[PDB]
């Protein structure tokens, strides 16, 4: 004797030992990047090429 | 019978319920479940939780 077993209700588990079927699937898929940066470039220059002479002294 | 026909007792009084269900047994007058799908829904719900998993 098994006990009361239902007649429309889907074949579940339902006490211990009775058997499931379990679909193994996974997919994972985690992911992350990041980035900086930084930059700086200065020239300067003068050039008194040719001096007038009332500027020579400075 | 006039003071009860006038009057109302404090703390006496008529609160609101509300809910939501299926109706069954309709001779094809129900609805038509393509454009609300909440009967469909929860008809499954219901199915699922007496034991039938659609």
């Known amino acids: 004797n098994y006990g009361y077993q239902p007649l429309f209700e889907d074949r579940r588990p339902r006490n211990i030992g009775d058997t499931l079927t379990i679909v193994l699937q996974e997919n994972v898929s985690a992911s992350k990047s990041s980035s900086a940066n930084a930059s700086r470039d200065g020239k300067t220059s003068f050039g008194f090429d040719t001096v007038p002479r009332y500027l020579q002294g400075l | ?54």
């Open chain 2, 1 to 54: 019978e006039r003071i009860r026909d006038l009057t109302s007792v404090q703390g006496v009084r008529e609160n609101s319920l509300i809910g939501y269900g299926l109706v069954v047994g309709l001779d094809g007058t129900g609805d038509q479940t393509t454009q609300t799908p909440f009967t469909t829904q929860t008809l499954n719900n219901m199915l699922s939780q007496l034991g039938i998993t659609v």
